[PDB]
Amino acid sequence: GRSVDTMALWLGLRAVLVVAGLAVLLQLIRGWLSSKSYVFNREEIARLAKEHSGLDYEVAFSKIIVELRKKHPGHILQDEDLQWVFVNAGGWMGSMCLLHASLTEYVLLFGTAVDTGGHSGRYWAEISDTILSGTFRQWKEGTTKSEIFYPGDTIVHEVGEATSVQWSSGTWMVEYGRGFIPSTLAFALADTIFSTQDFLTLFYTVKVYSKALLLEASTHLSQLG
Amino acid sequence: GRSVDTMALWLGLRAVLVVAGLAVLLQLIRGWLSSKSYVFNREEIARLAKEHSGLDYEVAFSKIIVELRKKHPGHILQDEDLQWVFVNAGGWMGSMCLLHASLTEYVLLFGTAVDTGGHSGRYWAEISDTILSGTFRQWKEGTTKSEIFYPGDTIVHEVGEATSVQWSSGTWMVEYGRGFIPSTLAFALADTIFSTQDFLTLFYTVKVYSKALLLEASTHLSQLG
Amino acid sequence: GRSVDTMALWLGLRAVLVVAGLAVLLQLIRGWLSSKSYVFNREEIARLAKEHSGLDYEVAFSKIIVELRKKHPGHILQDEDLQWVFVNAGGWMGSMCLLHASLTEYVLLFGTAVDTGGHSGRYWAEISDTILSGTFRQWKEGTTKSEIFYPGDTIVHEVGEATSVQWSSGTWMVEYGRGFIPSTLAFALADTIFSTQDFLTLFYTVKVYSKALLLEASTHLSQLG
Ligand SMILES: CC(=O)[C@H]1CC[C@H]2[C@@H]3CCC4=CC(=O)CC[C@]4(C)[C@H]3CC[C@]12C
Ligand SMILES: CC(=O)[C@H]1CC[C@H]2[C@@H]3CCC4=CC(=O)CC[C@]4(C)[C@H]3CC[C@]12C
Ligand SMILES: CC(=O)[C@H]1CC[C@H]2[C@@H]3CCC4=CC(=O)CC[C@]4(C)[C@H]3CC[C@]12C
């Protein structure tokens, strides 16, 4: 009767429990043992973005791209491959311009011209965002209160951390990611597959990632000869 | 090692790339060669909605429905088949009252009593919305700035265009769509299937579409005899 | 030609129609005949939350938990099993602290530190929320206008009802659910499966539900001996 249904429900919940737990365990295993070849560091990107956060954000964009090319030649996409692509993920909607991407790092410009918010995602990568313009509200797991960050602040989304994120219209920022970057892709594409159905945006997203990987491989080949 | 994983990732990304690209190509093929039998035009609907946008939006609703019935008898649903149905799509939530729908056109009242926003969808159809009340912020692909539209303005979502859309509470509008209307359905229903699980709302949505199609077929039969 | 495509579309829409309708019918059948063993009632929970809604919401949380333990020993989770877990559902993002859960009832603290909103869900359960802090805007199906509720108000989400819900940052409330509780799970988890990909949050959610079920079974066993 009622006790039987309760027991059956508990059995099914324990099934879902062990499945989810082993998925998390495999995420931890794949991420921890993942490669860690690093061309940038988050403090360098943050300091560079904070220096230009008082400028108009598009002027800051240009100055940051020029400086990053100067300091890391062979690791930033050429002008012809720069493109604003919508990002729909975790219930929020923004847009990105990818500058660099490999198995273990990425650098991009990110922001939004609408008010939006949702789930940050949870993955084996450390993400850092330095605000050029607007506001970034972050709400961490396990708390009932959130915090608002302003131009020149850096927000660090730690490995394995989940937060709610919310951005006001006109919020633009410089983002650096470090860790097992492919493990973000399921989060990065899910709203496209299951909500927006925007397959041209998926095309753009995988296209720029593949171009960034090809650039990195080409630079590696040139550095070995 | 790391180069092997990079190459494998690039191969998988190229796979996803060609799949998405051929899906887009098939969307273009199906839409371009789709039928184009047109009973309305977007300028007619826009001018009629703009004329009544200074009225209370529900008075405007009634006056617009009466005028559309007068000008296109046999192509607007009867009072008994008018119903407000929630629409959950692309991360936003509004509601619609379908007035007309065929393979190639639709006319509906649309809006929201909550603040909401998300992805517009991308499909082979030209959508036009004339605001009776509230505000419509549109953020186009490839730009970092958005624009706000007010009562009496018409917003045109062009064929193959993707935007972010955001509406304030109390935003109501008259919508006309033209193109390959079935190709919108995947976008129109996805949040229901994968987010809200609201199967009665799905029932309502397909029910009213089928009634509008039956009306159109009946009028076609009467016009041939 | 065009008539053939119209007829085929109508046939497919009728297929989707009967599938959705029979799913709704099965929802009604399973829910109506579901068990109704009740330990709480919504008026008791609402009056207790309203009494403390003038306090700081975290003080209210503590006072409500203490009183519920005093009045229903053996039916509230111990301090060690209290945990704030994100809830991503219907396009909105909040967080919960589960206090009690069985096949037929649940009690939890719920709210959000970000501005958010979306679909309430539609299921065979009566949900009641009493606001301790913030604002709760509710937009019912079939209307073009919404209503805002304030601290001390109770909002009743009726069985089979669908609404849009919207909460401002800092909104916290005491929630009681009564009916066929498992039938909410598909709504409660869908955004996790198809949007956020946050499997650790899924792990937490099924874990606390299973602990609440085990507590209820243990109390039942002690009451029989
Ligand atoms: C804004 C945000 O949450 C970040 C976190 C991980 C980031 C993704 C990381 C992987 C990736 C690499 C690319 O080359 C395209 C952009 C994407 C898809 C990034 C888009 C923005 C994401 C989703
Ligand atoms: C508001 C909006 O984005 C529009 C764009 C395409 C529109 C859909 C077009 C197809 C359709 C026809 C119907 O008969 C029901 C409503 C729907 C499902 C429309 C709902 C509102 C949509 C989704
Ligand atoms: C806020 C809200 O919509 C409520 C309606 C039904 C509620 C769910 C009911 C079932 C359930 C029981 C649990 O033990 C964990 C929390 C959940 C998953 C509840 C989370 C909050 C929900 C989703």
Residue numbers in the entry:
A (entry chain A), B (entry chain A), C (entry chain A): -5 to 219
Describing publication, verbatim:
The sigma-1 receptor (σ1R) is an endoplasmic reticulum (ER)-localized, non-opioid transmembrane receptor implicated in many pathological conditions, including neurodegenerative disorders and cancer. So far, all reported σ1R structures are homotrimers, with the ligand binding site located inside the β-barrel domain of each σ1R monomer. The ligand binding site is located in the lumen of the β-barrel domain (β1-β10), whose opening is covered by two membrane-adjacent helices (α4/α5) at the carboxy-terminus. Here, we present crystal structures of σ1R from Xenopus laevis (xlσ1R) bound to two endogenous neurosteroid ligands, progesterone (a putative antagonist) and dehydroepiandrosterone sulfate (DHEAS) (a putative agonist), at 2.15-3.09  Å resolutions.
Fortunately, co-crystallization of the xlσ1R-progesterone complex produced higher-quality crystals that diffracted to ~2 Å and its structure was solved to 2.15 Å (termed xlσ1Rprog-co). The xlσ1Rprog-co structure was solved in the I432 space group with one xlσ1R protomer per asymmetric unit, and three xlσ1R protomers form a homotrimer. However, distinct from the tadpole-shaped density in xlσ1Runknown-lig, the electron density in the ligand binding site of xlσ1Rprog-co resembles a fish with a small head, a wide body and a short tail. Meanwhile, the 2.15 Å-resolution structure of xlσ1Rprog-co readily allowed a clear placement of a progesterone molecule into the fish-shaped density. The C3 carbonyl oxygen on A-ring of progesterone occupies the fish-shape’s head proximal to the ER membrane, whereas the C17 keto methyl group on D-ring occupies the fish-shape’s tail reaching towards the distal space of the β-barrel lumen. Progesterone binds slightly closer towards the membrane, mainly through hydrophobic interactions with W86 (β2), M90 (β2), L92 (β2), Y100 (β3), L102 (β3), F104 (β3), Y117 (β4/β5 loop), I175 (α4), F181 (α4), A182 (α4), and Y203 (α5). Interestingly, electron densities corresponding to six water molecules (Water403, 404, 434, 447, 473, and 474) were observed within the distal space of the β-barrel lumen. Water403 also forms a direct hydrogen bond with the C20 carbonyl oxygen of the progesterone tail. Thus, this water-mediated hydrogen bond network connects bound progesterone indirectly to the receptor.
